Write an enzyme that holds these catalytic residues in place. Structure first.
Site, PDB file in Angstrom:
ATOM      1  N   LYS A   1      11.434 -21.656   9.181  1.00 26.94           N
ATOM      2  CA  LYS A   1      10.139 -22.325   9.229  1.00 26.94           C
ATOM      3  C   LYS A   1      10.131 -23.487  10.218  1.00 26.94           C
ATOM      4  CE  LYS A   1       6.071 -21.703   7.577  1.00 26.94           C
ATOM      5  NZ  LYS A   1       5.386 -20.982   6.470  1.00 26.94           N
TER       6      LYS A   1
ATOM      7  N   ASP B   1       1.004 -20.043  11.887  1.00 25.63           N
ATOM      8  CA  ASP B   1       0.858 -20.538  10.525  1.00 25.63           C
ATOM      9  C   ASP B   1      -0.386 -21.416  10.471  1.00 25.63           C
ATOM     10  OD1 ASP B   1       2.448 -20.524   7.850  1.00 25.63           O
ATOM     11  OD2 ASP B   1       1.940 -22.638   8.125  1.00 25.63           O
TER      12      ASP B   1
ATOM     13  N   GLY C   1      -9.585 -19.418   6.731  1.00 29.31           N
ATOM     14  CA  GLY C   1      -8.867 -19.397   7.991  1.00 29.31           C
ATOM     15  C   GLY C   1      -8.625 -17.984   8.481  1.00 29.31           C
ATOM     16  N   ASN C   2      -7.410 -17.724   8.954  1.00 26.66           N
ATOM     17  CA  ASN C   2      -7.050 -16.404   9.453  1.00 26.66           C
ATOM     18  C   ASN C   2      -6.756 -15.450   8.300  1.00 26.66           C
ATOM     19  OD1 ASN C   2      -5.975 -14.458  11.641  1.00 26.66           O
ATOM     20  ND2 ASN C   2      -4.203 -14.712  10.285  1.00 26.66           N
TER      21      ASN C   2
HETATM   22  N1  LIG Z   1      -0.887 -17.615   9.173  1.00 26.75           N
HETATM   23  C1  LIG Z   1      -0.312 -16.480   8.775  1.00 26.75           C
HETATM   24  O1  LIG Z   1      -0.031 -15.591   9.561  1.00 26.75           O
HETATM   25  C2  LIG Z   1      -0.007 -16.298   7.318  1.00 26.75           C
HETATM   26  C3  LIG Z   1       0.517 -14.967   6.831  1.00 26.75           C
HETATM   27  C4  LIG Z   1       0.756 -14.979   5.395  1.00 26.75           C
HETATM   28  C5  LIG Z   1       0.515 -16.104   4.614  1.00 26.75           C
HETATM   29  N2  LIG Z   1       0.049 -17.244   5.137  1.00 26.75           N
HETATM   30  C6  LIG Z   1      -0.180 -18.390   4.257  1.00 26.75           C
HETATM   31  O2  LIG Z   1      -1.565 -18.492   3.921  1.00 26.75           O
HETATM   32  C7  LIG Z   1      -2.033 -19.838   4.040  1.00 26.75           C
HETATM   33  C8  LIG Z   1      -3.252 -19.884   4.951  1.00 26.75           C
HETATM   34  O3  LIG Z   1      -2.835 -19.743   6.306  1.00 26.75           O
HETATM   35  P1  LIG Z   1      -3.908 -19.460   7.471  1.00 26.75           P
HETATM   36  O4  LIG Z   1      -3.203 -18.741   8.595  1.00 26.75           O
HETATM   37  O5  LIG Z   1      -5.137 -18.854   6.843  1.00 26.75           O
HETATM   38  O6  LIG Z   1      -4.275 -20.943   7.971  1.00 26.75           O
HETATM   39  P2  LIG Z   1      -5.504 -21.188   8.979  1.00 26.75           P
HETATM   40  O7  LIG Z   1      -6.314 -19.918   9.056  1.00 26.75           O
HETATM   41  O8  LIG Z   1      -4.962 -21.811  10.240  1.00 26.75           O
HETATM   42  O9  LIG Z   1      -6.376 -22.298   8.207  1.00 26.75           O
HETATM   43  C9  LIG Z   1      -6.321 -22.405   6.788  1.00 26.75           C
HETATM   44  C10 LIG Z   1      -7.733 -22.565   6.243  1.00 26.75           C
HETATM   45  O10 LIG Z   1      -7.693 -23.193   4.959  1.00 26.75           O
HETATM   46  C11 LIG Z   1      -8.559 -24.328   4.912  1.00 26.75           C
HETATM   47  N3  LIG Z   1      -7.880 -25.472   4.254  1.00 26.75           N
HETATM   48  C12 LIG Z   1      -6.922 -26.243   4.797  1.00 26.75           C
HETATM   49  N4  LIG Z   1      -6.516 -27.203   3.928  1.00 26.75           N
HETATM   50  C13 LIG Z   1      -7.227 -27.048   2.796  1.00 26.75           C
HETATM   51  C14 LIG Z   1      -7.300 -27.722   1.479  1.00 26.75           C
HETATM   52  N5  LIG Z   1      -6.508 -28.783   1.189  1.00 26.75           N
HETATM   53  N6  LIG Z   1      -8.182 -27.243   0.576  1.00 26.75           N
HETATM   54  C15 LIG Z   1      -8.973 -26.189   0.849  1.00 26.75           C
HETATM   55  N7  LIG Z   1      -8.960 -25.532   2.020  1.00 26.75           N
HETATM   56  C16 LIG Z   1      -8.124 -25.906   3.017  1.00 26.75           C
HETATM   57  C17 LIG Z   1      -8.903 -24.683   6.349  1.00 26.75           C
HETATM   58  O11 LIG Z   1     -10.273 -25.064   6.451  1.00 26.75           O
HETATM   59  P3  LIG Z   1     -10.787 -25.893   7.729  1.00 26.75           P
HETATM   60  O12 LIG Z   1     -11.124 -24.825   8.741  1.00 26.75           O
HETATM   61  O13 LIG Z   1     -11.979 -26.658   7.209  1.00 26.75           O
HETATM   62  O14 LIG Z   1      -9.606 -26.754   8.104  1.00 26.75           O
HETATM   63  C18 LIG Z   1      -8.576 -23.439   7.157  1.00 26.75           C
HETATM   64  O15 LIG Z   1      -9.756 -22.721   7.534  1.00 26.75           O
HETATM   65  C19 LIG Z   1      -0.895 -20.670   4.608  1.00 26.75           C
HETATM   66  O16 LIG Z   1      -0.459 -21.607   3.618  1.00 26.75           O
HETATM   67  C20 LIG Z   1       0.196 -19.678   4.970  1.00 26.75           C
HETATM   68  O17 LIG Z   1       1.497 -20.116   4.561  1.00 26.75           O
HETATM   69  C21 LIG Z   1      -0.208 -17.355   6.441  1.00 26.75           C
HETATM   70  N1  LIG Z   2       4.631 -16.188   5.848  1.00 29.36           N
HETATM   71  C1  LIG Z   2       4.890 -16.592   7.225  1.00 29.36           C
HETATM   72  C2  LIG Z   2       4.800 -15.385   8.163  1.00 29.36           C
HETATM   73  C3  LIG Z   2       5.067 -15.717   9.619  1.00 29.36           C
HETATM   74  C4  LIG Z   2       5.540 -14.517  10.412  1.00 29.36           C
HETATM   75  O1  LIG Z   2       4.734 -13.590  10.626  1.00 29.36           O
HETATM   76  O2  LIG Z   2       6.720 -14.500  10.822  1.00 29.36           O
HETATM   77  C5  LIG Z   2       3.918 -17.674   7.678  1.00 29.36           C
HETATM   78  O3  LIG Z   2       2.817 -17.333   8.111  1.00 29.36           O
HETATM   79  O4  LIG Z   2       4.270 -18.851   7.599  1.00 29.36           O
END
Ligand SMILES: NC(=O)c1ccc[n+]([C@@H]2O[C@H](COP(=O)([O-])OP(=O)(O)OC[C@H]3O[C@@H](n4cnc5c(N)ncnc54)[C@H](OP(=O)(O)O)[C@@H]3O)[C@@H](O)[C@H]2O)c1
Ligand SMILES: N[C@@H](CCC(=O)O)C(=O)O
Length: 418
Positions: free
Chosen positions: A104, A144, A220-221
């Site tokens: 990470k 992320d 988000g994404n």
């Molecule tokens: N990124 C990946 O590829 C991925 C894959 C699997 C799992 N995840 C997990 O899923 C989670 C979301 O990631 P993401 O990629 O979706 O992030 P992201 O799209 O970059 O943004 C996260 C979204 O959540 C909202 N947010 C942020 N802080 C918040 C809070 N305290 N309360 C309520 N809403 C909030 C934000 O709203 P605003 O637009 O208003 O800031 C943003 O739109 C992460 O914790 C990550 O570990 C991510």
């Molecule tokens: N769960 C990880 C996945 C990142 C990856 O695709 O390697 C993150 O989004 O933080």
């Protein structure tokens, strides 16, 4: 955060290792990240001044292979958060049987206060700082929170410039744009995996998801694509969404595309036409059939654990539920998809993108979709049967599936004798 993320992660690891045969030395090895790198990232601001940010690259274990994990850009980030995320990454890649370890990265920065040029400079400087610990066979970053494929491409270009194009630079980082070595289906990867896990959980529970209600936290994404795919593939009705500024609820259902357009034309989903403005706390307590937290961690604690009224909680986010809250939810008869199993898809697709990069040959949408479905279904059913046979919590069962594999790797490397 209610409690320290790394402490919580260690508590979960011990709580779950209480149901398996693992040596004390292996547990001590697994309770400590294997390498942590804290670096200063200097960039030049638009006004000409030089500002130094704090960056972390924490790999927790690489017994099973090169470490994998995204890069988080967050003002509230701490080294403990990155350590906990890397530890969760390890189990995440172990549960779906990938040749990866856990890793990470992060930068303590508010990206909303940075311009495009400043963001590019920050990404390039971060790569220049952490080049010595990353690589296509050492550590593979990914997108992320508050990071996107744009930043991924900038980081890949900087790494290729430093690496002098000696090897597969495209494979140093995943979640890249398709033009510069991207993979099809990576944009909706974590959402697709979450949807597959939700479908399998409904199948196990005997629930027809058509016409049911899903509430998604975070837009988000992951959150937006989860809502869109649930409305499209599972036939669900998205009744409420949210972002950091608040949420919108509608009993009749929301169209994710219109909500995204509103959020892109106004900055937030608040005051969306035809919907009622609510808080994230209120959204988590809504009467829905599926609740998918896709935002910051630790959103379900003893302050709202008893107020959750969803049949299935799909932990799309990383560690959104505390162990205590896990016990309360399990006592309430609510099925939980574990965090590092529900959002395995994103890590499953990234691995796919990696293979394509190192082999120099790229696949199609159908092949990626088929392989992801196969992997997610196998992992979910393994965890489900594990929790059913031993009569334990879901979270714990996945650990038994994950940690054991990691444990085996050490016994195959000689790291731990017992
Ligand atoms: N990124 C990946 O590829 C991925 C894959 C699997 C799992 N995840 C997990 O899923 C989670 C979301 O990631 P993401 O990629 O979706 O992030 P992201 O799209 O970059 O943004 C996260 C979204 O959540 C909202 N947010 C942020 N802080 C918040 C809070 N305290 N309360 C309520 N809403 C909030 C934000 O709203 P605003 O637009 O208003 O800031 C943003 O739109 C992460 O914790 C990550 O570990 C991510
Ligand atoms: N769960 C990880 C996945 C990142 C990856 O695709 O390697 C993150 O989004 O933080």
């Amino acid at each position: 955060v209610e409690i320290d993320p790394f402490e919580m992660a260690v508590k979960q690891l011990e709580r779950a290792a209480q149901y398996m045969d693992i040596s004390e030395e292996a547990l001590e090895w697994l309770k400590k990240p294997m390498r942590i790198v804290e670096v200063s990232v200097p960039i030049e601001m638009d006004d000409g001044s030089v500002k130094v940010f704090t960056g972390f690259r924490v790999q927790h274990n690489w017994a099973r292979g090169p470490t994998k994990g995204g890069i988080r850009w967050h003002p509230a980030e701490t080294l403990s958060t990155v350590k906990a995320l890397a530890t969760w990454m390890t189990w995440k890649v172990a549960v779906v049987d990938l040749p990866y370890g856990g890793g990470k990265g992060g930068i303590i920065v508010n990206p909303k206060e940075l311009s495009e040029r400043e963001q590019e400079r920050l990404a390039r400087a971060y790569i220049r700082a952490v080049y010595d610990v990353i690589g296509p066979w050492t550590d593979i970053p990914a997108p992320d929170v508050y990071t996107n494929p744009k930043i991924m491409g900038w980081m890949m270009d900087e790494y290729e410039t430093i690496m002098r194009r000696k090897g597969p630079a495209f494979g140093v980082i995943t979640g890249k744009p398709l033009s510069i070595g991207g993979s099809l289906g990576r944009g909706t990867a974590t959402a697709q995996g979450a949807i597959f896990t939700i479908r399998e959980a409904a199948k196990a529970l005997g629930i027809d998801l058509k016409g049911k209600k899903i509430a998604v936290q975070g837009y988000g994404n992951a959150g937006y694509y989860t809502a869109k795919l649930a409305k499209e593939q599972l036939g669900m009705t998205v009744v409420a969404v949210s972002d950091s500024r608040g949420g919108i609820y509608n009993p009749d259902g929301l169209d994710p595309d219109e909500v995204l357009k509103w959020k892109r034309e106004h900055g937030s989903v608040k005051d969306f036409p035809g919907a009622t403005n609510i808080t994230n706390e209120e959204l988590l307590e809504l009467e829905v059939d599926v609740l998918a937290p896709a935002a910051i961690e630790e959103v379900i604690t003893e302050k709202n654990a008893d107020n959750i009224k969803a049949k299935i909680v799909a932990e799309v986010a990383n560690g959104p539920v505390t162990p205590e809250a896990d016990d309360i939810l399990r006592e309430k008869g609510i099925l939980q998809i574990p965090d590092f199993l529900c959002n395995a898809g994103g890590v499953t697709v990234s691995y796919f993108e990696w293979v394509q990069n190192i082999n120099g040959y790229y696949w199609t949408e159908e092949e990626v979709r088929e392989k992801l479905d196969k992997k997610m279904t196998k992992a979910f059913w393994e965890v489900y049967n594990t929790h059913k046979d031993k009569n334990i919590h879901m979270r714990d069962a996945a650990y038994v599936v994950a940690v054991s594999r990691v444990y085996q790797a050490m016994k195959d490397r000689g790291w731990v004798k017992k």
